[PDB]
Amino acid sequence: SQSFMRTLGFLYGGRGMRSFLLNRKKKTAEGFRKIQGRDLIRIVFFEGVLYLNGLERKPKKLPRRFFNMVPLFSQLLRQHRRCPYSRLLQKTCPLVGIKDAGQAELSSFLPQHCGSHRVYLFVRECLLAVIPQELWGSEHNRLLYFARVRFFLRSGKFERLSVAELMWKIKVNNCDWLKISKTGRVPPSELSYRTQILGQFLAWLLDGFVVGLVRACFYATESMGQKNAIRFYRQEVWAKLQDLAFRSHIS
């Protein structure tokens, strides 16, 4: 009965990496399969997340522009599967006696939450370990984006995301992976289309990737503990708090 954690994780989060987007399987006619670079391109640029559930749109074959991105996104998925998420959580906002709890009280774990700056460091290390450098386009573009994530996580307004703010001063043409040609002048419609694709990716990267990690690895609550402040608990510590709260009140 381990199917529950995936389902409840998908709906409500706070159950760890198992229900994280990149760990999900694509549904075939007879069952399920691991996702490949081509599948990810579909999720990011074409059908969206529902591609995993069978949603199809034309073109079926990837255009040449997006076909050339396959190796890079395959690389991304490979780096994701090799990423030591537990280690990175343990070296940014580690657990304090959760598996060794023994007989600790509820108040012992209440102070054990992660500040938004710590949640940034974890998410920052994840971006460095998973996202291939050539996808950033430049060192300038990676640093601007990292600053955008920092502000986003600090603000605590996860629904007030702005693409215009995310893309501001990003150098679109630094990203070779958007292009089908380096020869000749770049017309407005091509630049506009390059901006459109990069928008999708950068926006996915915040909403899908970054927020995905936050949703899976943490649980935020609006207590506890005074009004008003948002506290992020590692989902393991949150699972401990729920358990001890509902054991004393349930004989």
Side-chain angles (χ1 to χ4, degrees), residues 235-248:
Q235 111 264 333
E236 297 91 336
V237 198
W238 187 255
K240 190 104 276 192
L241 285 167
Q242 288 297 303
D243 184 48
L244 297 161
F246 284 90
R247 257 151 33 88
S248 186

Side-chain angles (χ1 to χ4, degrees), residues 217-237:
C217 303
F218 299 92
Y219 186 91
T221 188
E222 60 183 4
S223 308
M224 289 255 98
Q226 302 303 314
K227 291 182 181 179
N228 282 296
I230 303 304
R231 287 180 174 183
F232 293 98
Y233 288 88
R234 290 270 308 262
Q235 111 264 333
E236 297 91 336
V237 198

